[PDB]
Amino acid sequence: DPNAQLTTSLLQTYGDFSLMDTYRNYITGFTQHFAGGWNVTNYAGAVHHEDDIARRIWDRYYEVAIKNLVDAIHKSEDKANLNAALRIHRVYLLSVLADTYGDIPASEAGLGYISGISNPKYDTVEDLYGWFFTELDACEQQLGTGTDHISGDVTSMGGDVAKWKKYANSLRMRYAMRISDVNPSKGQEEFEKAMNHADGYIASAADDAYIKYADSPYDFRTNALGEILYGQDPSSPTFVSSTLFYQLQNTGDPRLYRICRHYYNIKRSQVKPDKEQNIDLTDEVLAYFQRNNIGEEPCNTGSAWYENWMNVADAAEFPTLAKLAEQDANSYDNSDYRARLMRPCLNIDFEMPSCPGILITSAEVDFLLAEAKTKGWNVSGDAESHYEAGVRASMEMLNNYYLTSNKISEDEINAFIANNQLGENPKQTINTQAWILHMMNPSEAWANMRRSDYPALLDRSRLATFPGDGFVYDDPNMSMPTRLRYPELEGQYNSVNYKAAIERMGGTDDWHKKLWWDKSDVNVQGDFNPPYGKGYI
Numbered sequence: 001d002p003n004a005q006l007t008t009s010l011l012q013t014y015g016d017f018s019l020m021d022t023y024r025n026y027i028t029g030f031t032q033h034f035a036g037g038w039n040v041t042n043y044a045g046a047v048h049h050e051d052d053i054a055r056r057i058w059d060r061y062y063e064v065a066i067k068n069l070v071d072a073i074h075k076s077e078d079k080a081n082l083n084a085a086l087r088i089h090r091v092y093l094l095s096v097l098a099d100t101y102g103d104i105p106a107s108e109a110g111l112g113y114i115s116g117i118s119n120p121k122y123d124t125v126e127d128l129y130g131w132f133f134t135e136l137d138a139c140e141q142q143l144g145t146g147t148d149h150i151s152g153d154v155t156s157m158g159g160d161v162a163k164w165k166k167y168a169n170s171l172r173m174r175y176a177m178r179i180s181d182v183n184p185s186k187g188q189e190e191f192e193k194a195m196n197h198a199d200g201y202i203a204s205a206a207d208d209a210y211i212k213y214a215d216s217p218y219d220f221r222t223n224a225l226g227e228i229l230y231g232q233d234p235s236s237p238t239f240v241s242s243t244l245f246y247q248l249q250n251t252g253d254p255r256l257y258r259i260c261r262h263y264y265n266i267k268r269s270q271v272k273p274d275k276e277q278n279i280d281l282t283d284e285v286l287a288y289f290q291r292n293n294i295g296e297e298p299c300n301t302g303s304a305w306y307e308n309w310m311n312v313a314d315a316a317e318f319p320t321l322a323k324l325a326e327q328d329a330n331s332y333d334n335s336d337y338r339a340r341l342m343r344p345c346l347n348i349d350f351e352m353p354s355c356p357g358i359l360i361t362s363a364e365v366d367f368l369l370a371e372a373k374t375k376g377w378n379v380s381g382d383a384e385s386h387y388e389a390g391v392r393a394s395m396e397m398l399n400n401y402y403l404t405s406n407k408i409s410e411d412e413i414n415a416f417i418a419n420n421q422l423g424e425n426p427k428q429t430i431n432t433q434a435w436i437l438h439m440m441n442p443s444e445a446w447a448n449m450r451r452s453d454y455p456a457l458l459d460r461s462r463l464a465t466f467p468g469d470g471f472v473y474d475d476p477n478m479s480m481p482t483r484l485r486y487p488e489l490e491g492q493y494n495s496v497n498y499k500a501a502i503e504r505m506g507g508t509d510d511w512h513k514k515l516w517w518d519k520s521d522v523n524v525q526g527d528f529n530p531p532y533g534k535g536y537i
């Protein structure tokens with residue numbers, strides 16, 4: 001039943017816990033949104049490849065979503081609306097697969113490959129992006145030529161063909177920007193084609209495209225990215241990196257302590273994050289810093305929370321934990337949980353099972369329009385207006401989709417924008433602000449970081465490594481990987497096509513090899529001397 005297969009494929013995007021290891025261990029580490037958990041320190045922090053972690057995106061999307069999409073596409077030629085929606089989500093997941101690994105099966109990933117009886121070649125990144133524009137144009141026009149109801153839709157589009165059209169056009173704008181370095185003229189042409197389309201694009205948050213997940217306890221119904229970020233036990237929360245912390249603090253970003261909180265979480269629930277026992281001591285922690293003329297030490301990329309050891313405050317320092325330590329010291333005076341309380345952690349609001357699965361937002365389109373303007377493309381309105389719109393929408397998406405309290409006021413948004421105008425390097429400003437936007441969309445975060453080379457990351461090569469703590473540094477090139485390696489079993493079961501793709505790369509499956517649309521290395525910060533804690537060597 002094709003509509004059901006649309007549902008499974010949509011939900012798998014963020015709903016499949018079995019590929020979230022790749023996002024917590026590698027991608028969100030590579031983007032330097034998160035740092036300090038043992039896993040991201042072991043993998044992304046050590047620049048340490050391991051097949052079983054790197055393969056999961058490939059293996060799980062091909063085994064489930066792509067299989068179901070292709071079968072449903074072939075079973076839906078009489079249901080043009082559903083057919084177009086199936087095909088748009090295939091383009092979507094193929095763009096993620098290609099942006100992650102490089103050349104990938106696509107044009108030959110068909111019914112035979114589904115049945116496990118045929119071996120698909122790896123389409124080149126350049127050929128795939130060419131096909132993205134063509135296929136999205138075709139689907140966009142096909143939408144609404146059927147009378148069938150897209151009942152398997154679980155996105156915010158809610159089966160509305162007009163909303164799927166704007167989604168397809170917005171993805172065209174995303175891909176057109178992606179190729180704007182390697183093929184400037186095609187990027188310009190494809191962008192303005194979509195931007196000027198009669199059916200429009202995602203112009204306000206009312207038209208945001210996202211998958212809707214269920215508010216049920218921790219089969220793709222719940223957002224598994226939040227699940228793995230919440231950790232599978234209270235000793236493994238997701239710690240916010242110093243890169244993100246310092247981007248927020250140093251720009252006066254009201255998002256600083258919406259994204260960052262301090263938790264003592266020993267009795268927290270494991271079926272659904274609870275305010276009761278994810279004890280939010282943020283204000284009391286900050287009051288403690290201020291009393292002692294000290295401050296935050298957000299974990300550096302490459303380091304774990306127990307490295308670059310920060311002094312641990314006694315329970316007495318925090319009145320809420322103090323009175324609970326005095327009631328029950330085994331629970332609330334545990335020194336390990338006090339230690340992790342010291343570091344900024346991701347708000348559990350971002351870790352709820354019902355968190356959305358972002359596909360593309362009006363805030364991103366705003367930033368695309370801003371950069372399109374700074375490139376001279378024929379866009380209406382100045383770069384600053386689009387830029388400001390995108391900052392305001394990124395702000396507002398947290399109010400609308402995530403925050404359960406402490407919403408960001410219109411005063412704060414207006415204040416922040418005034419202090420962070422475009423400046424002398426708009427491309428850097430635009431893409432740094434998009435990178436915050438993309439926190440919970442790690443694949444777009446990593447792709448757009450790679451293409452735009454902003455934000456300037458912390459130079460991993462000048463941050464500490466901790467081999468004495470069991471981590472393995474088996475790669476001399478410690479700069480951020482620009483892709484993931486192919487699943488190693490492809491070398492056996494798709495051996496000839498695997499060899500070919502590797503040969504096109506230069507003869508080895510090299511995760512320091514830049515993809516076709518990635519023309520330069522991501523920028524890095526020249527200096528990192530934080531007021532508290534450790535910086536560059």
Ligand SMILES: [Mg+2]
Nearest residue numbers: 450520521522
């Ligand atoms: Mg690059």
